[PDB]
Amino acid sequence: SDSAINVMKWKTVSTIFLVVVLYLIIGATVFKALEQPQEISQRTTIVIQREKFLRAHPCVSDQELDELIQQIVAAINAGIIPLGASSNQVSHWDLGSSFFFAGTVITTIGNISPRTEGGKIFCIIYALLGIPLFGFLLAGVGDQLGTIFGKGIAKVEDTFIKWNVSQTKIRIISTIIFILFGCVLFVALPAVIFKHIEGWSALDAIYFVVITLTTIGVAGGSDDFYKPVVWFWILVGLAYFAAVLSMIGDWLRVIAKKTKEAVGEFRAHA
């Protein structure tokens, strides 16, 4: 009973391991079909600019022009706009831009990293202590928003109450109005807002938000009335996708137990 269920558990996780392995193989085979065509077009035509610019200017050193670009590529990862025109520059660590990157570290959202030892060592501890600190703010807003929605759904679930009202199915009308109100607020409105400031397309504003509020991975700059109100949204939108990504785990745990019985029957009866 103590380690008997643990022989049951090692199975259940080793199986999930293979689901993710397949899921990565699937994603790999999909991304290599979607992106590797677009990459060859870019490289095989960037050779033509390489091949042009050596013939546009033969007197520059050939092998060293590669090294010159490599030293630019390596020196892009800093705060970098290197030119004799636009040599005057702003700091990527100014009054508010370092405030930004402090905000990414504790959120674990994420080209410009610190280069100082003291910066790297402070950041290690700033993260190891700021990530848990932020976790309480996120969870605090998570249940703060949980009652903003809990009181809003206490009204909605009463306004269809006729005779013959089932309590197991109105729970699903509520889960519809949460993806509905949610993605209208947190996915629809900001994505439309970034079209009229940065000029983003229709997709890339939603692609941005999903990658952002899932903390996987910018429109803050415009070259201070506009960042502080957005950082609010980010915190609440992070609490939003925190619930959303957790909901999907509820579905995936249902789908697991439903495919669990399906294989059990269809291999027992056959």
Q: Which long-range contacts (CB under 8 A, 24 or more apart) does 76-84 make?
A: 76/111, 77/111, 77/112, 77/113, 78/112, 78/115, 79/112
248 binds ligand CCCCCCCC (CB under 6 A): no
Binding positions for a second copy, 74-103, rule CB under 8 A:
74-85, 87, 89, 91-96, 98-99, 101-103
Choice from 175, 180, 197, 207 touching a second copy (CB under 8 A): 207
Q: Is 247 in the site for ligand CCCCCCCCCCCC (CB under 6 A)?
A: no
* Residue carrying structure tokens 């700091």: 91
Least distance in angstroms from the C-beta of 256 to ligand CCCCCCCCCCCC? 4
Residue 110 as a binder of K ion (CB under 5 A): the answer is yes
Q: Kindly state the number of chain residues that form the binding site for ligand D10, as judged by CB under 6 A.
A: 4
> Judged by CB under 6 A, does residue 26 bind ligand CCCCCCCCCCCC?
yes
Q: Is 29 annotated as a binding residue?
A: no
Say how far apart CA 110 and CA 217 lie, in whole Å: 6
Write phi, then psi, for 101 (nearest 5 degrees). Answer: -70, -25
Site for ligand CCCCCCCCCCCC in 114-153 (CB under 6 A): 129
Q: Which does 259 bind (CB under 5 to 8 A by kind): ligand D10, K ion, a second copy, none?
A: none
CA distance linking residue 257 with residue 263, whole number of Å: 10
Can you tell me the distance from the alpha carbon of 238 to that of 215, in angstroms, rounded to the nearest whole number? 8
Are 217 and 110 spatial neighbours (Cβ–Cβ below 8 Å)?
yes
121 binding ligand D10? (CB under 6 A): yes
Q: Is 15 in a helix, a strand, or coil?
A: helix
Q: Does 259 bind ligand CCCCCCCC (CB under 6 A)?
A: yes
| Interaction pattern, residues 101-120, with ligand D10; x per rule: CB under 6 A | ----------------xx--
Sites for K ion among residues 214-253 (CB under 5 A): 215, 217
212 a known binding residue? Answer: no
Residue 263 interacting entry, from a second copy, ligand D10, ligand CCCCCCCCCCCC, none, C-beta within 5 to 8 Å by type:
ligand CCCCCCCCCCCC
Q: Could you tell me if 201 and 219 are in contact, meaning their C-beta atoms sit under 8 angstroms apart? A: no
The letter for the amino acid at 2 is: D
Torsion 162-163-167-168 (CA) sign: negative
- CA separation, residue 241 to residues 236, 248, 261 (Å): 9, 10, 30
Q: Of the listed pieces 37-45, 102-110, 139-147, 222-230, which binds K ion according to CB under 5 A?
A: 102-110
Alpha helices in the chain (DSSP H): 4-34, 36-56, 62-74, 97-107, 117-156, 170-182, 189-193, 202-213, 227-268
Q: What's the token pair of residue 1?
A: 């009973």
CA-based nearest residue to 91, from 229, 83, 99: 99
Q: Which two tokens stand for residue 100?
A: 């930004």
Residue 116 annotated as binding site: no
Residues flagged as binding site for K(+)? 108-110, 215-217
**Residues within the interface to ligand D10 (CB under 6 A):** 117-118, 121-122
| Binding region | 108-110, 215-217
Binding site for ligand CCCCCCCC (CB under 6 A): 19, 121, 124-125, 128, 252, 255-256, 259
